[PDB]
Each structure stands twice: as C-alpha cells, then as structure tokens.
Amino acid sequence: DDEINAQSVWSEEISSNYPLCIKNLMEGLKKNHHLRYYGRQQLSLFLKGIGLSADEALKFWSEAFTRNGNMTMEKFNKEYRYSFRHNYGLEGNRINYKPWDCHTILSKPRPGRGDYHGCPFRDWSHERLSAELRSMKLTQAQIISVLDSCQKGEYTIACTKVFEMTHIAHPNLYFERSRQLQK
Ligand code: SF4
Numbered sequence: 001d002d003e004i005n006a007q008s009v010w011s012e013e014i015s016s017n018y019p020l021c022i023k024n025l026m027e028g029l030k031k032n033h034h035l036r037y038y039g040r041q042q043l044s045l046f047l048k049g050i051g052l053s054a055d056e057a058l059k060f061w062s063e064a065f066t067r068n069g070n071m072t073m074e075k076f077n078k079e080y081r082y083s084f085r086h087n088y089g090l091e092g093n094r095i096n097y098k099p100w101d102c103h104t105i106l107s108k109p110r111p112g113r114g115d116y117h118g119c120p121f122r123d124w125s126h127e128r129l130s131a132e133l134r135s136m137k138l139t140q141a142q143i144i145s146v147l148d149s150c151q152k153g154e155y156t157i158a159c160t161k162v163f164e165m166t167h168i169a170h171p172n173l174y175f176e177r178s179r180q181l182q183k
Pocket residue numbers: 019020021022101102105106118119120121155156159169170171174
C-alpha cells in the first residue's frame with residue numbers, strides 16, 4: 001500500500017503512467033462521481049492489476065461515488081459496495097476477474113453517450129484526440145502520425161506511439177512500463 005493506494009492513484013505521479021483509456025475513465029469518475037457498468041469493470045480491474053488492495057479499492061470507489069454529495073454512503077453501500085467486493089472475490093466467488101487487455105477492451109460494446117469504457121484511439125474524434133495529445137506536449141508531426149495509426153484501425157500501435165513520444169497489448173503493461181521509467 002506504500003506506493004499504490006486509494007490516495008496515490010489520484011496523484012499526478014502515479015496517474016502520469018496511465019494509458020489514455022484509464023485517464024479517460026478516471027476523468028469521467030472525477031467529473032461525474034460515478035461510472036456505468038463497463039467502465040466500472042474496466043477501471044476497477046485495471047486498478048486491481050496495478051496492486052490496489054481490496055480495502056484501498058473500497059476506499060477509492062466509495063469516496064469517488066459519494067464525492068461532492070453525489071450519493072450518500074448508505075446508497076453506495078446498498079447499490080455498489082457488493083459489486084466492487086465481488087470484483088475482488090470478497091464474498092467468496094471464484095470467478096476469474098483478471099484485468100482486461102486491449103483486445104478485450106476493444107471487443108466490449110462500443111461506448112455510447114455517458115460511457116467512458118473503451119479505447120480513446122478508436123472512440124474519440126480526431127479533434128478530441130489532437131487536443132488531448134497537445135496537452136501531453138506532442139507536436140503536430142507526432143499527432144499526425146498517431147492519427148494515421150488511428151485511421152488505419154491500429155489502435156494499439158497508436159497507443160504505443162504515444163508511450164514512446166511521451167517518454168500482448170495491455171493497459172497494465174503500459175502502466176508498468178511507464179512506472180518502471182520513474183524508478
Ligand atoms: S490501446 Fe489499449 S491501453 Fe492504449 S488506450 Fe487503447 S485500450 Fe487503453
């Protein structure tokens with residue numbers, strides 16, 4: 001818990017290592033104080049995969065869902081706590097909930113209005129992606145190359161380009177490779 005915990009996953013230091021899909025999910029969670037089902041699973045299983053413990057996960061999700069008065073803790077406990085405990089096996093289930101790889105993420109239903117799951121290299125417009133990539137300090141030539149991969153359907157190559165330019169396809173591998181470059 002020294003490094004990955006409910007508080008540190010909101011730090012710029014740790015979150016600088018998140019790939020775009022995780023950044024998007026964290027932003028939707030921060031703004032809306034909620035995530036719909038597919039995004040709850042994609043993010044909660046990614047965070048489990050980077051080492052967020054069961055106790056710290058329940059801190060993280062209960063604090064994020066009840067933030068700014070969005071819902072009471074009683075409502076969180078009645079309507080969401082079981083779901084997060086289930087993802088960690090804490091009610092005894094033996095379903096294998098491993099973090100989703102990129103192919104799994106891409107194969108989930110595409111996000112509609114109000115959804116933050118998926119892969120931004122596919123799901124975002126080029127203008128949204130360009131603005132996001134500019135905020136990550138990429139230049140026009142870099143953005144054009146990333147968008148070229150996106151237009152070709154090569155989303156994991158686009159993501160790999162972003163990793164290289166800012167420093168099996170899997171968000172947790174992106175995180176681990178990026179975090180190792182801070183150590
Ligand atoms: S390529 Fe994979 S890790 Fe990168 S943003 Fe898309 S789903 Fe996430």
